[PDB]
Protein backbone atom coordinates (compact mmCIF):
# COMPACT_ATOMS: atom_id res chain seq x y z
CA UNK A 1 0.00 0.00 0.00
CA UNK A 2 3.23 2.02 0.24
CA UNK A 3 2.72 4.50 3.12
CA UNK A 4 4.77 6.14 5.85
CA UNK A 5 7.59 4.02 7.45
CA UNK A 6 7.13 4.12 11.28
CA UNK A 7 10.37 4.08 13.30
CA UNK A 8 10.69 3.57 17.01
CA UNK A 9 13.87 3.89 19.01
CA UNK A 10 15.35 3.78 22.49
CA UNK A 11 18.82 3.24 23.96
CA UNK A 12 19.90 2.10 27.41
CA UNK A 13 23.02 1.71 29.46
CA UNK A 14 24.31 0.73 32.89
CA UNK A 15 26.74 3.40 34.11
CA UNK A 16 28.59 5.62 31.63
CA UNK A 17 30.68 4.24 30.23
CA UNK A 18 28.97 0.88 30.90
CA UNK A 19 27.50 -1.94 28.78
CA UNK A 20 24.35 -0.92 26.91
CA UNK A 21 22.06 -1.44 23.97
CA UNK A 22 19.37 -0.09 21.68
CA UNK A 23 15.96 -1.02 20.42
CA UNK A 24 14.51 -0.22 17.04
CA UNK A 25 11.13 -1.13 15.52
CA UNK A 26 10.68 -0.16 11.88
CA UNK A 27 7.43 -0.72 9.89
CA UNK A 28 8.62 -0.48 6.25
CA UNK A 29 5.71 -1.42 3.88
CA UNK A 30 3.61 -3.79 6.08
CA UNK A 31 6.45 -5.72 7.77
CA UNK A 32 7.81 -5.17 11.34
CA UNK A 33 11.61 -5.62 11.57
CA UNK A 34 13.21 -5.20 15.01
CA UNK A 35 16.88 -4.25 15.50
CA UNK A 36 18.79 -4.56 18.78
CA UNK A 37 22.39 -5.13 19.87
CA UNK A 38 24.42 -4.55 23.05
CA UNK A 39 27.81 -2.91 23.46
CA UNK A 40 30.73 -3.51 25.88
CA UNK A 41 31.88 0.02 26.81
CA UNK A 42 29.58 2.84 25.71
CA UNK A 43 27.22 5.54 26.91
CA UNK A 44 23.52 6.27 27.20
CA UNK A 45 23.41 8.96 24.46
CA UNK A 46 25.60 7.03 22.05
CA UNK A 47 23.00 4.28 22.35
CA UNK A 48 20.08 6.62 21.91
CA UNK A 49 21.64 7.96 18.70
CA UNK A 50 22.87 4.57 17.51
CA UNK A 51 19.24 3.46 17.67
CA UNK A 52 17.91 5.92 15.05
CA UNK A 53 20.82 5.28 12.71
CA UNK A 54 20.69 1.54 12.32
CA UNK A 55 16.94 1.96 11.77
CA UNK A 56 17.33 4.81 9.24
CA UNK A 57 20.39 3.29 7.60
CA UNK A 58 18.19 0.24 6.90
CA UNK A 59 16.04 2.09 4.34
CA UNK A 60 17.64 1.90 0.86
CA UNK A 61 14.85 4.13 -0.50
CA UNK A 62 13.58 7.65 0.14
CA UNK A 63 10.57 7.27 2.38
CA UNK A 64 8.35 9.63 4.32
CA UNK A 65 9.48 8.76 7.91
CA UNK A 66 8.04 9.14 11.42
CA UNK A 67 10.40 8.71 14.36
CA UNK A 68 9.19 8.37 17.91
CA UNK A 69 11.80 8.56 20.70
CA UNK A 70 12.10 9.72 24.26
CA UNK A 71 15.80 10.56 23.79
CA UNK A 72 16.33 14.00 25.29
CA UNK A 73 19.67 14.10 23.44
CA UNK A 74 18.43 13.21 19.91
CA UNK A 75 15.66 15.79 20.45
CA UNK A 76 18.07 18.59 21.42
CA UNK A 77 20.81 17.74 18.86
CA UNK A 78 18.00 17.66 16.21
CA UNK A 79 15.87 20.71 17.28
CA UNK A 80 18.64 23.01 18.49
CA UNK A 81 22.19 21.79 17.74
CA UNK A 82 22.80 19.78 14.51
CA UNK A 83 22.48 22.85 12.22
CA UNK A 84 24.56 25.35 14.19
CA UNK A 85 27.31 22.69 14.28
CA UNK A 86 27.72 22.08 10.54
CA UNK A 87 27.63 25.82 9.78
CA UNK A 88 30.66 25.69 12.05
CA UNK A 89 32.42 22.53 10.97
CA UNK A 90 31.14 20.32 13.77
CA UNK A 91 33.45 21.60 16.52
CA UNK A 92 32.95 23.46 19.82
CA UNK A 93 33.78 27.13 20.43
CA UNK A 94 37.32 26.00 21.47
CA UNK A 95 37.76 24.38 18.03
CA UNK A 96 37.47 20.82 19.36
CA UNK A 97 35.37 18.05 17.78
CA UNK A 98 31.76 18.21 18.95
CA UNK A 99 31.09 15.30 21.26
CA UNK A 100 29.64 12.29 19.42
CA UNK A 101 30.73 13.43 15.95
CA UNK A 102 31.15 9.90 14.60
CA UNK A 103 27.51 9.41 15.45
CA UNK A 104 25.90 12.80 14.73
CA UNK A 105 27.48 12.78 11.24
CA UNK A 106 26.71 9.12 10.56
CA UNK A 107 23.11 10.04 11.44
CA UNK A 108 22.88 13.25 9.32
CA UNK A 109 24.13 11.20 6.39
CA UNK A 110 20.99 9.11 6.86
CA UNK A 111 18.73 12.02 8.02
CA UNK A 112 19.30 13.98 4.79
CA UNK A 113 17.91 11.29 2.45
CA UNK A 114 14.34 10.83 3.62
CA UNK A 115 11.66 13.17 4.86
CA UNK A 116 11.47 12.19 8.58
CA UNK A 117 8.85 13.66 10.89
CA UNK A 118 9.76 14.02 14.58
CA UNK A 119 7.55 12.50 17.27
CA UNK A 120 8.86 13.24 20.74
CA UNK A 121 7.48 11.12 23.59
CA UNK A 122 7.10 13.09 26.84
CA UNK A 123 5.65 12.01 30.20
CA UNK A 124 6.16 8.50 28.81
CA UNK A 125 2.67 8.83 27.31
CA UNK A 126 4.17 7.43 24.16
CA UNK A 127 3.28 3.95 22.98
CA UNK A 128 3.52 0.21 23.56
CA UNK A 129 6.20 -0.11 20.91
CA UNK A 130 8.22 2.71 22.44
CA UNK A 131 8.48 0.29 25.38
CA UNK A 132 9.40 -2.94 23.48
CA UNK A 133 12.44 -0.76 22.79
CA UNK A 134 13.03 -0.01 26.47
CA UNK A 135 13.06 -3.78 27.01
CA UNK A 136 14.78 -4.58 23.76
CA UNK A 137 17.51 -2.13 24.76
CA UNK A 138 17.62 -3.08 28.44
CA UNK A 139 18.41 -6.73 27.68
CA UNK A 140 20.89 -6.12 24.91
CA UNK A 141 22.86 -4.28 27.61
CA UNK A 142 22.63 -7.49 29.66
CA UNK A 143 24.79 -9.28 27.20
CA UNK A 144 26.67 -6.87 25.00
CA UNK A 145 28.54 -8.27 22.00
CA UNK A 146 29.55 -5.34 19.90
CA UNK A 147 32.27 -2.76 20.20
CA UNK A 148 31.63 0.94 20.72
CA UNK A 149 34.92 1.56 19.07
CA UNK A 150 33.95 5.22 18.47
CA UNK A 151 33.53 6.06 22.17
CA UNK A 152 36.20 8.55 23.27
CA UNK A 153 37.00 9.20 26.95
CA UNK A 154 36.85 12.97 27.12
CA UNK A 155 37.06 15.10 23.90
UniProtKB/Swiss-Prot annotation:
Its EC number is 3.1.26.4. This is Ribonuclease HI. GO terms for biological process: DNA replication, removal of RNA primer. Belongs to the RNase H family. Keywords: Cytoplasm, Endonuclease, Hydrolase, Magnesium, Metal-binding, Nuclease. Residues 1-142 form the RNase H type-1 domain. It is found in: Cytoplasm. It comes from Escherichia coli (strain K12).
Amino acid sequence: MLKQVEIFTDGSCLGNPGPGGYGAILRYRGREKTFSAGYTRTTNNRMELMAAIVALEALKEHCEVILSTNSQYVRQGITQWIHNWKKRGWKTADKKPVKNVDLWQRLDAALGQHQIKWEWVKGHAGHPENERCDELARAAAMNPTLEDTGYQVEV
